[PDB]
Amino acid sequence: AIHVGHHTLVFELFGMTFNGDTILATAVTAVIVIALAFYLRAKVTSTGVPSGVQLFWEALTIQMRQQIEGSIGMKIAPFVLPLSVTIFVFILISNWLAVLPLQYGGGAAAELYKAPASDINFVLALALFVFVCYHAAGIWRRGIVGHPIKVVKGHVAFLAPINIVEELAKPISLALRLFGNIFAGGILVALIAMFPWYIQFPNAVWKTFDLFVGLIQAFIFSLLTILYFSQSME
Amino acid sequence: DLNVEIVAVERELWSGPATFVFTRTTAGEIGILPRHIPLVAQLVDDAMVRVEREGEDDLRIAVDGGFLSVTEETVRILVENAQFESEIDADAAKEDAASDDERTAAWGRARLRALGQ
């Protein structure tokens, strides 16, 4: 049978419970991202032919700057560029790492590395950080008094009740879209684990979707973050 | 009934009454019977036109970059240059349809469509 939750390495500290497996997966993806960043630093050059990681970073930064400038120029929001990029890779590397052959049989199926996005804590951390950050940006640009006023007013004043709710919806959905996309997958690949090995082709088909959908979800998450910044920064 | 005025910048080509007029606009094929809604459209660079009227045969026109206007009584077809079926030369059109120049190739293909295929 399938299980939901059942996190491993769970511990308790400071009066709070922590999912050890989720933290370990987040740390693994974070250290991979940091290794990529430091390899760029060690091998970044403008006077010579770029490295592979340099090309990847240039492409991602150019894309994110293109989305930012098309909605909110970096003269107003230069800080959302280092954000939108990391949110991408942090999510992307988080999802694609689940494509490694790290699934085995306990007889219940288990995985050494389970995608952090499959945990509500990871997605909520990312989504609420984005929420707080772009609300702070909106407060800065419109003022602590004017920002709530323009948030409630929105584009149409008399639609105020439909505005506030949407503002509270942005984070939740921004999280739930990421979690549901990956959590669901965590069940599919577990269900595929019930097949015998010679029937268990379905992993190849789903894994490719997981690559595709993880890339799409990283892109959508980052781009919706940029859009939220564009909206909250006038 | 319809009256079709196929007019060229140089001169007019035909203005007699017609029952049905058919041609390839840039949006696709189109046919017109009387009382059609007023319209403005651009013909494809290789557009061919066919007009059907009482008794007489089908009048086929090789049209170069024309424009079709539909009015509450008239249907006018402006053409940079248009040639009737009775005037076209098969060998010359065949040779020109393969020309490298886009305009020349389109004109040749229009002339072939005026004959067939």
Partner: protein, 81 residues
């Protein structure tokens, strides 16, 4: 008593996902229809249409995946059990 509630929760979650999948599939198909039509009309649109497109998908998927979240509550954490 728990069996009845479990069957009801399964049916409810099935309805949740049926609606979510209908909405997601149809909305994503419509958004992709717009994307494909725009790219066919003006090829370079490739560059600029993935921003509004993935926003639309982002809106279409939300209503789906939120439902999916509320499915997990229905199926794995049945509120009224």
């Amino acid at each position: 008593p728990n069996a009845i509630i479990t069957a009801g929760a399964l049916i409810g979650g099935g309805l949740i996902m049926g609606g979510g999948a209908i909405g997601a599939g149809i909305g994503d198909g419509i958004a992709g229809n717009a994307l494909i039509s725009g790219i066919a009309r003006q090829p370079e649109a490739q560059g600029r249409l993935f921003t509004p497109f993935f926003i639309t998908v982002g809106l279409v998927e939300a209503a789906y995946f939120i439902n999916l979240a509320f499915m997990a509550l229905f199926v794995f954490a049945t509120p009224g059990l």
